[PDB]
């Protein structure tokens, strides 16, 4: 749980494999397992989707961070094919993918670097830039000149 | 104004209260570092002011 509450990393799910297998073995607590598998397709779908529910939910994560984790590479350390990686996209166009970009020369993907208007994305980030380091610059120097005067 | 007249009335100001009130209105005009809301017009002539200058043409 406190894996899946937030800043999920990048794990290998083999580690789950054995705790999932351990939580079906072990009959103290949560004991049916073999209920949630008692069908022979439901149990089957609560799982693929499961391991596609947390592996499309590790994108929706790191897609607020733009460091441009080079998805290419991140395939050859997730050890699957590039194909269920497009059926995964097939789920973003879904998911509201249409923030985006991507290249048809490499397969590289970007969730930033949009058109950039000036008056709007720029004209908000130095707006905050500039008037937070004003009154920042304002609070703490006469406050800070408040602070050296208990000195005399 | 029978029985009733009136008078007439003059001001005085002294330098103290002439640059106290005077800096202070001034002051009361103007922003806290002065440097703040400069910008604010300075960005806001490219995302407000245009479409008070469409709405000016």
């Not at chain 1, 054995?18 to 397992?33: F, H, I, Q, V």
């Not at chain 1, 609560?46 to 607020?64: G, P, Q, S």
């Not at chain 1, 990686?85 to 509201?96: G, H, Q, T, W």
Request: proline share 1%.
């Amino acid at each position: 749980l406190l894996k899946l509450f937030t800043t999920m990393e990048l794990m290998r799910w083999s580690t789950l494999v054995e705790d999932y297998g351990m939580e079906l073995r072990k009959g103290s607590l949560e004991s049916p397992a073999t209920d949630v598998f008692g069908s022979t397709e439901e149990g089957e779908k609560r799982w693929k989707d499961l391991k596609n529910r947390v592996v499309e939910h590790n994108i929706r994560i790191m897609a607020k961070y733009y460091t441009r984790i080079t998805m290419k590479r991140m395939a050859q350390l997730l050890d699957l094919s590039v194909d269920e990686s497009e059926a995964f996209l097939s789920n973003l166009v879904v998911n509201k993918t249409i923030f985006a970009k991507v290249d048809r020369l490499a397969g590289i993907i970007n969730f930033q670097r949009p058109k950039d208007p000036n008056n709007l994305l720029n004209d908000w980030s130095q707006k905050l830039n500039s008037l937070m380091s004003l009154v920042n610059k304002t609070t703490h120097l006469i406050a800070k000149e408040e602070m050296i005067h208990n000195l005399q | 104004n029978r029985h009733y007249y009136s008078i007439t009335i003059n001001y005085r100001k002294n330098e103290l209260e002439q640059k106290m009130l005077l800096n202070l209105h001034k002051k009361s005009w103007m922003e806290g570092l002065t440097l703040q809301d400069y910008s604010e017009h300075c960005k806001h002539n490219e995302s407000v002011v245009k479409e008070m200058l469409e709405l000016a043409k």
